[PDB]
Amino acid sequence: HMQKPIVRVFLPNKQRTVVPARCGVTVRDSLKKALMMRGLIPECCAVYRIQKKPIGWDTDISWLTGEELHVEVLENVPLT
Amino acid sequence: SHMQKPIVRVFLPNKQRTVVPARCGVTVRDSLKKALMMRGLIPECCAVYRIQEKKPIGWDTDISWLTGEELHVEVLENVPLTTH
């Protein structure tokens, strides 16, 4: 809304959160706490918008005000 | 087939494709670096998925775990970074 710009975020395991769509704040930093609370970290997850479209973790979240993001855990395959 | 020559099939943006060697110890990023560059892409501007149906994998994944699989590379949504 005009007063309170937010982004709705759907999380693993049927969970969800709302974060403020603050200018200059990455998606990564916007969601760090919500992820931590659930034992997740951005580096082990992918984020996407709707309208199944992947977005970078370093995106400025204010560009996505009004949108829904989805966070999925990355496939469990060993790193090099 | 793969016994002698383990490979991963990779689908790329704009209906393109490539095959890469699935060699132990090599990242997805590095396996695909050259194919992406030929198309003016960079892994950091893209996402990669395995077919299982599209499940996101990390760029630093060891590609040898994916022998026989099909990967898909998509360009990230065009949304400014905070540094822009």
SS (H, E, C) B39-64: CCCCHHHEEEEEECCEEEECCCEEHH
Which residues on neighbouring strands pair with residue A59, listed in sequence order? Answer: B81
CATH architecture of B7-75: Roll (3.10)
Give CATH for domain A6-73: 3.10.20.90
Of A68, A74, A49, nearest to A9 by C-alpha is A68
Residues 6+ apart with CB under 8 A from A23: A60, A62
With CB atoms and an 8 Å threshold, state whether A80 touches B61: yes
Helices (H), chain A: 27-36
The residue with tokens 């943006």 is B13
CB contacts < 8 A, A to B, total 74
Count CB neighbours of B38 within 10 A: 11
On chain A, the residues whose CB falls within 8 A of the CB of B52 are 75
Experimental method: X-ray
On chain A, the residues whose CB falls within 8 A of the CB of B83 are 58
Tokens found for residue B7: 């490979």
DSSP secondary structure letter of residue A1: -
Residue type (1 letter), A12? P
